[PDB]
Amino acid sequence: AKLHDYYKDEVVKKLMTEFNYNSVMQVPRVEKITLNMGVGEAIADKKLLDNAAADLAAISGQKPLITKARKSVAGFKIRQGYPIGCKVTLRGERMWEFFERLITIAVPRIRDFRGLSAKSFDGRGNYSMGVREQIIFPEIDYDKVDRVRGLDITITTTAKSDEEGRALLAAFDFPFR
Amino acid sequence: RSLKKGPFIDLHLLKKVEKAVESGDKKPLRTWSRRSTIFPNMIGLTIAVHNGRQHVPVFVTDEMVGHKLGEFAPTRTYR
Amino acid sequence: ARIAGINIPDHKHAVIALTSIYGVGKTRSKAILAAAGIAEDVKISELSEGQIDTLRDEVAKFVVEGDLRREISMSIKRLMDLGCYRGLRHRRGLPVRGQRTKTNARTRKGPRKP
Amino acid sequence: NPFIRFEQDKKLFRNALEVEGLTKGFDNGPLFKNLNLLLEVGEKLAVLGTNGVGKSTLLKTLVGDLQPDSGTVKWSENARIGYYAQDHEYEFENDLTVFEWMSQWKQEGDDEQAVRSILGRLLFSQDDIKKPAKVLSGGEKGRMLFGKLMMQ
Amino acid sequence: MKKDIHPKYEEITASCSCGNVMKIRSTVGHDLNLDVCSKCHPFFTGKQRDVATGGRVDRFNKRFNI
RNA sequence: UCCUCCUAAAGAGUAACGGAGGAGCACGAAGGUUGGCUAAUCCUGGUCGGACAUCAGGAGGUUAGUGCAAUGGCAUAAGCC
RNA sequence: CCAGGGCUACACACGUGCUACAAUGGCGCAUACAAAGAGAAGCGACCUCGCGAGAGCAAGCGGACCUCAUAAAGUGCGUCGUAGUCCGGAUUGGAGUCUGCAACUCGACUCCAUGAAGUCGGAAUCGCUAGUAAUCGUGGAUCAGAAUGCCACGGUGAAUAC
Ligand SMILES: Nc1ncnc2c1ncn2[C@@H]1O[C@H](COP(=O)(O)OP(=O)(O)OP(=O)(O)O)[C@@H](O)[C@H]1O
Ligand SMILES: [Mg+2]
Numbered sequence: 001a002k003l004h005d006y007y008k009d010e011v012v013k014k015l016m017t018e019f020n021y022n023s024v025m026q027v028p029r030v031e032k033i034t035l036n037m038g039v040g041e042a043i044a045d046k047k048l049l050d051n052a053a054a055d056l057a058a059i060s061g062q063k064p065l066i067t068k069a070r071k072s073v074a075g076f077k078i079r080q081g082y083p084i085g086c087k088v089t090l091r092g093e094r095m096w097e098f099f100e101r102l103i104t105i106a107v108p109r110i111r112d113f114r115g116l117s118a119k120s121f122d123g124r125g126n127y128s129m130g131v132r133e134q135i136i137f138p139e140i141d142y143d144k145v146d147r148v149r150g151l152d153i154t155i156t157t158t159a160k161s162d163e164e165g166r167a168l169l170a171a172f173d174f175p176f177r
Numbered sequence: 178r179s180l181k182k183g184p185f186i187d188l189h190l191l192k193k194v195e196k197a198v199e200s201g202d203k204k205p206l207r208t209w210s211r212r213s214t215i216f217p218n219m220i221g222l223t224i225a226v227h228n229g230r231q232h233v234p235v236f237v238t239d240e241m242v243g244h245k246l247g248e249f250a251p252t253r254t255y256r
Numbered sequence: 257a258r259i260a261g262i263n264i265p266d267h268k269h270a271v272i273a274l275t276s277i278y279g280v281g282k283t284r285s286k287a288i289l290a291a292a293g294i295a296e297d298v299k300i301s302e303l304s305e306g307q308i309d310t311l312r313d314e315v316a317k318f319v320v321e322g323d324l325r326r327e328i329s330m331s332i333k334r335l336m337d338l339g340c341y342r343g344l345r346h347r348r349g350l351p352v353r354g355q356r357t358k359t360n361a362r363t364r365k366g367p368r369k370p
Numbered sequence: 371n372p373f374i375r376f377e378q379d380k381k382l383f384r385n386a387l388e389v390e391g392l393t394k395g396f397d398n399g400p401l402f403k404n405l406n407l408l409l410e411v412g413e414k415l416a417v418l419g420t421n422g423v424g425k426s427t428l429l430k431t432l433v434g435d436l437q438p439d440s441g442t443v444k445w446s447e448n449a450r451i452g453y454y455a456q457d458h459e460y461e462f463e464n465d466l467t468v469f470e471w472m473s474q475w476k477q478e479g480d481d482e483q484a485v486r487s488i489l490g491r492l493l494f495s496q497d498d499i500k501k502p503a504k505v506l507s508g509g510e511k512g513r514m515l516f517g518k519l520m521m522q
Numbered sequence: 523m524k525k526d527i528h529p530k531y532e533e534i535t536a537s538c539s540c541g542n543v544m545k546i547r548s549t550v551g552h553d554l555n556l557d558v559c560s561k562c563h564p565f566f567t568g569k570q571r572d573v574a575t576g577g578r579v580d581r582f583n584k585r586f587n588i
Numbered sequence: 589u590c591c592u593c594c595u596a597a598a599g600a601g602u603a604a605c606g607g608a609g610g611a612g613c614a615c616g617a618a619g620g621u622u623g624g625c626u627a628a629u630c631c632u633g634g635u636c637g638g639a640c641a642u643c644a645g646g647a648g649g650u651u652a653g654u655g656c657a658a659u660g661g662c663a664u665a666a667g668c669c
Numbered sequence: 670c671c672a673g674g675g676c677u678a679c680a681c682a683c684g685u686g687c688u689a690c691a692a693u694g695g696c697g698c699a700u701a702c703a704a705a706g707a708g709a710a711g712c713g714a715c716c717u718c719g720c721g722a723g724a725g726c727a728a729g730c731g732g733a734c735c736u737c738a739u740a741a742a743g744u745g746c747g748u749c750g751u752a753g754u755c756c757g758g759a760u761u762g763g764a765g766u767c768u769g770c771a772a773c774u775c776g777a778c779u780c781c782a783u784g785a786a787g788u789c790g791g792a793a794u795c796g797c798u799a800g801u802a803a804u805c806g807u808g809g810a811u812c813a814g815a816a817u818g819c820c821a822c823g824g825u826g827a828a829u830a831c
């Protein structure tokens with residue numbers, strides 16, 4: 001949306017001068033957003049996973065992909081094929097539409113918001129963030145929902161380092177400390 | 178809870194507190210005034226109050242100003 | 257009908273529905289209607305949605321269920337960490353106002369465990 | 371011997387029924403005139419009579435399905451009514467299976483276990499629950515409606 | 523998109539009490555009114571107004587009216 | 589009675605009341621074909637979440653997998669949809 | 670002899686009580702009918718201030734005159750319409766008044782908020798034959814302050830005894 005051309009018109013020029021880039025497109029860019037939540041206790045009951053899937057489809061207008069256990073582990077008593085959690089990945093336009101409304105309404109609605117930590121990068125330039133609450137998004141009316149299941153936001157950028165990854169997210173007015 | 182006026186402390190504690198602040202931190206004061214309220218000038222001291230058998234060292238911090246000296250000295254043992 | 261948390265109870269007089277807010281009792285309830293121009297006898301489902309707006313802001317001047325739980329929590333938590341005598345009685349789960357524990361005080365001790 | 375037991379959820383305390391005057395009759399002389407009634411939380415109230423006098427039409431309008439010319443039946447504040455009709459065939463339709471049919475009736479228990487046990491407690495083997503719920507016969511149709519009120 | 527297996531996704535008008543009228547695409551079905559957005563959220567000026575819990579010495583000193 | 593390895597001396601075969609393990613089945617798809625896909629284990633970052641669930645990157649390379657014991661095999665996959 | 674602490678400690682058990690579980694009851698407004706008793710480093714009118722505990726000035730009374738001191742159930746109107754509720758009042762946080770050198774261990778009371786167990790109680794067991802049982806209020810002793818206990822006073826007032 002507006003964030004996309006804002007990136008084209010401002011962020012590219014902001015980062016080109018800062019890091020002394022020689023080519024136009026060597027500046028990093030975000031390529032996808034991955035949303036999930038592993039309900040886990042859906043081992044006992046099935047209707048929780050269908051409820052979580054309805055939440056993710058409300059937060060982002062896509063049907064979540066149900067994910068199943070990769071290997072049987074006796075610690076939590078699960079086996080291969082058991083659906084454990086959902087997953088949604090956003091690319092292109094729908095990525096920006098969710099991204100713009102994450103940084104502008106959802107995060108400011110966090111109860112006792114103090115600031116998102118800037119040391120959450122995975123060592124290559126990608127950002128991961130928990131939310132602990134699915135009510136901060138306006139698409140939840142607090143009455144349909146029953147549980148307090150949290151999401152897991154992942155920012156997959158093409159940055160070669162977290163030093164560049166921090167700068168790219170900062171140029172989008174990301175609430176770091 | 179005391180009354181409308183006059184946070185009540187004994188002279189001998191108040192007199193001893195005055196000489197305690199003139200030399201910074203010092204040795205703990207061996208006092209018996211459990212009823213004496215903690216004045217703000219007692220912050221940072223290491224007053225020792227009687228619990229019946231043993232003077233216990235209580236280190237007065239900024240948050241203990243409305244309480245009394247014997248309030249931080251348990252006087253009966255359990256388990 | 258709808259205040260800070262929820263004014264769910266309908267069919268009830270005004271001075272009773274506002275009692276459902278954690279932080280509003282009875283005299284604090286009557287303070288709202290005295291300055292809101294609404295009589296005590298008035299029903300919640302009968303008053304207009306415009307007067308709900310005036311009810312909302314008067315309640316907001318007090319401290320209610322949201323921030324009052326935090327406000328109370330620090331009051332208890334301060335004593336516990338400070339190591340006061342009342343802090344000890346909060347940790348041990350015994351009455352703090354200096355009363356009997358020989359046979360009574362089942363409210364703080366709880367169910368009888370022999 | 372199937373092992374069935376019914377347990378409450380809120381257990382109202384004062385009374386359940388409140389009937390003022392029923393005066394319900396289909397196409398002939400009305401089967402009852404007023405029938406002032408009160409239950410008082412218990413009183414298992416065995417309705418009786420020879421067949422054809424309208425004891426089943428009393429219960430059907432006591433639960434609010436058939437509208438009477440009465441003045442309402444005034445259930446309690448938190449009544450959770452469980453119905454076992456004299457004829458029970460509309461429930462066993464749409465070719466749900468034994469496990470499928472039982473599953474939707476629940477409020478807090480889990481879908482895989484704690485409904486297999488309740489369904490399997492009343493004599494339903496492992497291979498008996500993977501067949502359509504409409505092909506059941508007689509007592510098993512009745513036994514389902516006892517299990518229906520187990521989780522409910 | 524896989525042809526009507528997803529919820530409806532349209533454009534709504536989300537606005538704040540202090541303005542902040544920003545058009546967005548969401549799945550609610552009706553416009554939404556909320557508090558101050560990230561533009562006017564006091565996460566960058568109320569820091570001193572946020573860490574203020576406490577105060578006992580000065581409160582007693584007020585009661586020292588003699 | 590049948591199957592796998594060693595004794596069995598680099599073709600086949602080769603004994604002992606020699607050393608070790610399995611079978612008396614299963615599947616109407618777990619067969620045929622076409623299209624597509626690639627694991628274990630680790631690190632980092634991430635709400636409940638934890639040594640270990642689900643996710644995002646990187647190392648690794650088949651140390652995974654095969655309805656069933658062992659041997660031989662399998663990336664053109666015989667493994668997974 | 671003195672200061673501080675204890676007799677107020679709490680996995681637990683018992684005895685005697687107070688308050689409740691409500692609709693012949695809660696709450697608001699108005700309105701009546703008592704007896705007995707105490708008071709001088711004491712009872713302390715009236716008025717003003719404080720929502721209240723009380724504070725300031727302060728007459729009278731060592732008294733059938735003055736103070737404590739309004740008695741309360743009852744009575745009429747309204748509301749609540751069977752809910753853990755407009756029942757219940759524990760526990761806890763905050764802000765205070767007063768007696769006292771001193772209210773932390775441990776005082777009473779008032780205000781704001783919080784508002785729990787309890788929806789008539791197992792085996793067993795207690796009191797009462799008439800102004801009695803049942804309930805409602807009041808005073809006195811001890812006492813600087815500190816009673817649901819003790820001693821006493823009256824109001825309404827039964828059922829049954831073959
Ligand atoms: N829809 C109807 N139309 C006409 N008459 C009806 C209708 N339903 C019931 N009746 C008649 O009214 C009476 C009510 O009978 P109903 O079907 O309620 O069962 P019942 O009398 O309790 O019988 P049973 O003891 O055999 O179950 C009967 O005489 C019946 O014939
Ligand atoms: Mg050979």
Ligand SMILES: [Mg+2]
Pocket residue numbers: none
């Ligand atoms: Mg050879």
Ligand SMILES: [Mg+2]
Pocket residue numbers: 602
């Ligand atoms: Mg030979």
Ligand SMILES: [Mg+2]
Pocket residue numbers: 618
């Ligand atoms: Mg095969």
Ligand SMILES: [Mg+2]
Pocket residue numbers: none
């Ligand atoms: Mg192929």
Ligand SMILES: [Mg+2]
Pocket residue numbers: none
């Ligand atoms: Mg094949």
Ligand SMILES: [Mg+2]
Pocket residue numbers: none
């Ligand atoms: Mg002594």
Ligand SMILES: [Mg+2]
Pocket residue numbers: 676
């Ligand atoms: Mg004693």
Ligand code: NA
Pocket residue numbers: 424425426427456
């Ligand atoms: Na019938």
